Each structure stands twice: as structure tokens, then as C-alpha cells.
Amino acid sequence: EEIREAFRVFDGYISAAELRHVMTNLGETDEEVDEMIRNYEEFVQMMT
Amino acid sequence: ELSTQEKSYLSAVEKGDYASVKLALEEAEIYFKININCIDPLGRTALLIAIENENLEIIELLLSFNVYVGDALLHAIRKEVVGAVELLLNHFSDFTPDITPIILAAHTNNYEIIKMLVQKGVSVPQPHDVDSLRHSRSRLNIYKALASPSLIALSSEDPFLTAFQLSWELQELSKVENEFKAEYEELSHQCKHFAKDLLDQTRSSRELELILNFRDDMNLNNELARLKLAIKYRQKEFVAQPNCQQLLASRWYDEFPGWRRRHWAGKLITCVFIGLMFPLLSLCYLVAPKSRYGLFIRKPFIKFICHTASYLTFLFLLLLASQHIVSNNPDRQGPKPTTVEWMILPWVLGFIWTEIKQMWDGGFQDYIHDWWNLMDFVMNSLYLATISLKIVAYVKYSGCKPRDTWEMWHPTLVAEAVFAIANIFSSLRLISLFTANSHLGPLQISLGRMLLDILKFLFIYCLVLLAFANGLNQLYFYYENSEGMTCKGIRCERQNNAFSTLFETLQSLFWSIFGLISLYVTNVKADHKFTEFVGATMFGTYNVISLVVLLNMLIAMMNNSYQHIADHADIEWKFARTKLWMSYFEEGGTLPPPFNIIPSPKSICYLITWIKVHVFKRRSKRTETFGTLGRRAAENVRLNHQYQEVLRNLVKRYVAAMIRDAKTEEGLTEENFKELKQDISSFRYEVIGMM
Ligand SMILES: CCCCCC(=O)OC[C@H](COP(=O)(O)O)OC(=O)CCCCC
Ligand SMILES: [Ca+2]
Numbered sequence A: 001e002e003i004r005e006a007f008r009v010f011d012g013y014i015s016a017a018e019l020r021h022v023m024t025n026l027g028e029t030d031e032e033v034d035e036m037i038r039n040y041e042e043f044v045q046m047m048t
Numbered sequence B: 001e002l003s004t005q006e007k008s009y010l011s012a013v014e015k016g017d018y019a020s021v022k023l024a025l026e027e028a029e030i031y032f033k034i035n036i037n038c039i040d041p042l043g044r045t046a047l048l049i050a051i052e053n054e055n056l057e058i059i060e061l062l063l064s065f066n067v068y069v070g071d072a073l074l075h076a077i078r079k080e081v082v083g084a085v086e087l088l089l090n091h092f093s094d095f096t097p098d099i100t101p102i103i104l105a106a107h108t109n110n111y112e113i114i115k116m117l118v119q120k121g122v123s124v125p126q127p128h129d130v131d132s133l134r135h136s137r138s139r140l141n142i143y144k145a146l147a148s149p150s151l152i153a154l155s156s157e158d159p160f161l162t163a164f165q166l167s168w169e170l171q172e173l174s175k176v177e178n179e180f181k182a183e184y185e186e187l188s189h190q191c192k193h194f195a196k197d198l199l200d201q202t203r204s205s206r207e208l209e210l211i212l213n214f215r216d217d218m219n220l221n222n223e224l225a226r227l228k229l230a231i232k233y234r235q236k237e238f239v240a241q242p243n244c245q246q247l248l249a250s251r252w253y254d255e256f257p258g259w260r261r262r263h264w265a266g267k268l269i270t271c272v273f274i275g276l277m278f279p280l281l282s283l284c285y286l287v288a289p290k291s292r293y294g295l296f297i298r299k300p301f302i303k304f305i306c307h308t309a310s311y312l313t314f315l316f317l318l319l320l321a322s323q324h325i326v327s328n329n330p331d332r333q334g335p336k337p338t339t340v341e342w343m344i345l346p347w348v349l350g351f352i353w354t355e356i357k358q359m360w361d362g363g364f365q366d367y368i369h370d371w372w373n374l375m376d377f378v379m380n381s382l383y384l385a386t387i388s389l390k391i392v393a394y395v396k397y398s399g400c401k402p403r404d405t406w407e408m409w410h411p412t413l414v415a416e417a418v419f420a421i422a423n424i425f426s427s428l429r430l431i432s433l434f435t436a437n438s439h440l441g442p443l444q445i446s447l448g449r450m451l452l453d454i455l456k457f458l459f460i461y462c463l464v465l466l467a468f469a470n471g472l473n474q475l476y477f478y479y480e481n482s483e484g485m486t487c488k489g490i491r492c493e494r495q496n497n498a499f500s501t502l503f504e505t506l507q508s509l510f511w512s513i514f515g516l517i518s519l520y521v522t523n524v525k526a527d528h529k530f531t532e533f534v535g536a537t538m539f540g541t542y543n544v545i546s547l548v549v550l551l552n553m554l555i556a557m558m559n560n561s562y563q564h565i566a567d568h569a570d571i572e573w574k575f576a577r578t579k580l581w582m583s584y585f586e587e588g589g590t591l592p593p594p595f596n597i598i599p600s601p602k603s604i605c606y607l608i609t610w611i612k613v614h615v616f617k618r619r620s621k622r623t624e625t626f627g628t629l630g631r632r633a634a635e636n637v638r639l640n641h642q643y644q645e646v647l648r649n650l651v652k653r654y655v656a657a658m659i660r661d662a663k664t665e666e667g668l669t670e671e672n673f674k675e676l677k678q679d680i681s682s683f684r685y686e687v688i689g690m691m
Helices: A030-036 B006-014 B019-030 B046-052 B056-064 B072-078 B082-089 B101-108 B111-119 B133-146 B149-154 B159-177 B181-200 B205-212 B225-232 B242-252 B266-287 B294-298 B300-320 B339-362 B371-395 B411-435 B440-448 B451-475 B502-514 B529-563 B569-585 B607-611 B633-663 B670-689
Strands: none
Touching: A030 B633, B006 B019, B006 B046, B019 B056, B019 B670, B046 B056, B046 B072, B056 B082, B072 B082, B072 B101, B082 B111, B101 B111, B101 B133, B111 B149, B111 B633, B133 B149, B133 B159, B133 B181, B149 B159, B149 B181, B149 B633, B159 B181, B159 B225, B159 B633, B181 B633, B205 B225, B205 B242, B205 B633, B225 B569, B242 B300, B242 B569, B266 B294, B266 B300, B294 B300, B300 B339, B300 B411, B300 B569, B339 B371, B371 B411, B411 B440, B411 B569, B440 B569, B451 B502, B451 B529, B502 B529
């Protein structure tokens, strides 16, 4: 368990449209940042 | 099975004639006076004859006149003819029924043929039965198909990993089959050469570091992950590559450039300096590894020097543990530890702790795989037994007793004996360091790689020893002869009762191989001369079998063994040296054993949390510890794309250097002569026809 805590980012379904800037506000393009997803509720499971 | 009209037709094909072949083919339509797809006295169809000689023109005539193709495609694959295959694609057998065109094409490792078949969408099965040879042949054909370098270049998005898992599969399966072991071992060695030749095509250190530094992230750097994986697959010819070894050597001597100005004594003084210097060089890293000298031991070569210096000080304390300048009174049952023993004990704990640490990362999987690891495990177990026996002596010994009156099987004596055996193992264990030195390295490796033969042959030696011990005891069973033989046994001043029991007979038969036994052990306290004669004859037969037959056979066996472990004594030595180096690369047990047990600055913050695993504090590690966005994939994706581009370049270079160095560099066989002859013949026939 110990899941559903990291959803404290601004969203609520999550797609690739709104996260590109999220890792750009604190990070630094489309052709590779898009793959971070590459749908909802899969990033807290199968992490261990 | 013959004729006179069609034999002219096959002859006109075989000689490359064109007008006659066209005439015969066109005349076959109106009159059935010829069978087009007939068989010559050797077993060749007209189409197959044209394929065998690369005469594509007659091939396309036959194809346009609907001759029975049958399996002529496979025969075109064998002759690796590209034009005939291209013309055949746009359209009782001689082969095992399970062979597909792509399998056979992979067998020949021909790039122009694999290229075309894959574009047509062919596929290869993947392995894991009342009959057995069909299945076994199918499995071997499959492996030999996808073990071809040409096919790995087309498929296999990760050629290194593919070759690695494939070598592992075939190495582990050459024992499961055990009847085709030669073929499977050959294929595994072939794909190992493929991996090495693919690494060889790098052209820049930048191109090399990415290859060696790559691994699956899965949200779990540059610590040579691919290289450790290659070690894990026993890929000993991939890590013996020149420039890879150059990278490792550069990363081993990072503390100081050069190391080539060194000579007979230049390197000795700088290493002896650090070997003396390791105590405070270690303490500095222990307390303040910030900027001054803590990073000086973190560097790998310095770590090696400090470790071997700590081992040598351990051995010095062990030798000095027997001098009388420090030894306690012998006439003292279970004495308190001597000051030298107090110094020694931290090394014992350090070695035990480092071996537990090593166990806790291999999980008894590679732990047993290293014979050095087994030796040091038994050494530490003997140390543990020594400590336990010494303390259990100390709890009730009360001292004040001469050693000549101690009862047999007393804890102090057994503790001393175990301590001595452990000293033997400890002083032996430094042989492993000789893998680092470029001169005792290969020699020590060859020592290791004929120890198995000595074990095999020593088993037979022990069987023979047991046989002769059986007989000799049967013979001198009754002459007990212990009426005046003070200190009975083989190991006396007179060698009495050597064969009076099974243990002493085993022991006497052992010593006789060294000559340290004498005759007149075979005598008996009576005039029974026939018993003495037959006993002496049995003893002499044993000696002849051992020292003239068996030992000479051992020599003649290891002679050829060494003759067959020198071809890869360098590559295997470099693999062992790399295995030793990478043990010191990581920032793990950087602290030599004397300065290892010393607790960490926290020492109460990591042990407890790892101890909180049987309670609810095991789950309090992935919820509050991690709460960030995990911004790593964007770096991971770019890294993977860069590595894929590097692989693409390496593969293209490997192809361009396998076609131009192996295809055009082999011999000239009779078939090529026949093709050239028939080219000339067809030329003559056509120019005759045009006039
Ligand atoms: C292979 C077993 C040979 C017999 C060993 C043996 O003990 O017999 C030795 C006999 C008699 O000597 P002993 O029996 O040993 O006292 O002399 C020889 O025949 C020498 C032949 C020398 C042959 C090398
Ligand atoms: Ca070890």
C-alpha cells in the first residue's frame, strides 16, 4: 500500500497535456518528456 | 531411372546453354516427350542445377515455365545466392522438415538473405514428445538460428543483452542436453565472440562509457552497470577487450596520472608508503572524509593497498602470536587473551562482518561460486570456534597445571589447534591478491584451472588407497604387537604397528607415497615369513601403483591440461583481475577490517530502521520518505535514446566490418570454379547463337 499521496500536484484525471510544464517549472522537451506517462491510477502501483 | 532426351536437356542446363534449354522447354508444351522436373543420376532437378551455378537467366526461364519449385528456395539459401533468392521470392525433401527458410538463412549468417526474408515478415519460434531426436534437432536448429550475428543485427533491439542471455542459455543448456554439449558450447563461444566484436567497433571513449554505463532505470548512473552484468554472465571474453580494459585501468589509477614511470623500485616505494600509512589514512576517512584525505582512500588503488596492508599486518600479528616474547605461560589452563590476541580479535570481527556483508548481497548464489569465498568462510568459522572454545575454557579452567598432565580433549588444546588451522588458511588466502600482479596472475589462474583435474584424479587415488588399506588390514589384523611398543603408531621412533588397524593402515599408506615410511613395518613378531612376504608384496604393489603409475599419470594429465588452458590463460586472467578490481570500485566496504568494526557516526540510525521490518515501520518507507514528483524519466528517456543511437552505429560498423573482412576473405572452393566455368560456357553458347 502506502499509495495515493503523491497526487499533491495540480490536476482529477491526469493526462500528458498538463504535466509538460510541471517538470518544466522546476526542470528544463515534448519528444522525450511525453514518455514520462508512456490513463490514470497506474503510477502508484507496480513501483515495488 | 534415366532417358536420352531429357538428359540432353539437363546437360544443356548444366553447361549453361540458353537456346537449347529454351527450345526444350517450349517443345515440352506441345509434346509430352520429356518430363521437365526430372532427376539426374546424382539427385538434382533442372531448377536445382541452375541454382547451384548462379545462372539466374535460366532460373527465370524455368520459373516462367512453371517448373516444380519444391524446396529449391532452401537450396538457394544454402548456396547464399542473392539473385536466385530474389527471383524465387517473387514467385521427399533434402532438409529436416522443421527447417523454415529464415532458420536456414540464419544458419549461413548471410546478410543479404536475412535482409530479404525479414522484410517478407518471416518469424522464428522461441524454445522453452514421444520421439526425441526430432525435438532435439529442432531446438538446436532454433538456437543456431538466432545465435547468428547477422540475424542479431536485424532483430534484437538490444544486441548486447541478447548475446548475453543467449550465451547464458546455451552454456546452461549444454549440460542439460549433455549429448550435444560440443555444439552448444561452440555456439555459446561464438556468441561471446560476437559480443566482443560488437564492443570492439567503438571509436571514441565517449562511445564506450555509454555502453559500459547503461542499465534499466525502472525508477529505482555511471557505476559500470553493463560491465557488472557482463561479469554476472561469465562473459570473460567481453571484459578482456583492450579499450574496455583501458577504461577500467584509467578508472583504477585516478589518484595519480602515469604509473608508467614506475619500475622495479619506483612503484615499490610509493606502495610501501601507503601500506605503512593506512592507519591514519583510514582514520581520516573514518572521521572527516570531507575534503582533506578521506577521498584519498576512496580512490580504488589506494583502497586495495590499504586492504592488503591490513591483511599483511594481520599475518604479522599471527606470526608474532607464536613468539615467546608475548606468549602466556604454557602451564596455565585457559588463560586470559594475550595482548597480541586482543589486537588480533578486531581483525577476526572485521573479517566476519565483511563476509556477512558479502553474503547479504549475493544470497549464497555467487557466494558459494567463489572457491576463495568458501575458503575464507571456513577460516572465519574456525575463528568463531576458537573464540568460543577459548572463552568456555576461561569459564572453568582455574589454571595451574603442567601441559604434560593435561587430559586429552581439553578445550584449550582444541582451541589452539583450531587457531593454528585458521592461521594456515589465513596465510594462504592472500594468494588471491596475486591475480592483480601482472606476473603471478596468469600463473595463479592456471593453478586454479587444473585443480579440478587433481581432485578428479585424487578421488581415484583415494579409492586405491582404501583398497590397499582394506587388504593390508585383513592381513596384519591379528598381530596386535603392543607388548613393548611404547607409543604405538606409525608416527613413532620405530614405526611399529603400522598395519594393525584400519586408521593406522590408512595413515601408513598415506605416508608411503612420500617415502617417510620405512620397511620392517611389514615384519611381525613371529617367524611367519609367508605373511611378511605377502604383506611386503602388497605394500610394494601399492607403491608401484602410486609413485610410478598414478603420480606419473597425474603429471601426464596436467601436462595436456595446461596445454589446453594456456590458449585462454590471458583472457581468463584479465577477467579474474577485473572481478578483483570491481570489488574495490564501489563505495562499500572502503574501510580495512581493523578499522571496519568501528561504529559509524550514527551507528544507531541505520541498524534500527533496518531492524524495524517485522513491525509497522517496514511500510513507513515508501509513503513519507518519498513524496516528490520523481522527475527522472525525461533524463532516462534521453539517456536511452543516446544509448540506442550508439548501438545503431556500433551495429552498422559491425556489419560493414563483417561483410568486408569475413565474406570476401575466406577460401575459394570447387563450387566457385564450377560457377565461373559455367559463366564462360554460357557466354560461348550465346555468342555462338548470335552468329
Ligand atoms: C606391479 C607389482 C610388482 C611387484 C612388486 C613386489 O613387491 O614384488 C617385488 C619382487 C619381490 O620383492 P618384494 O615382494 O617386494 O619383497 O621382486 C620383483 O619381482 C621386482 C620386479 C620389479 C617390477 C617393477
Ligand atoms: Ca570474501
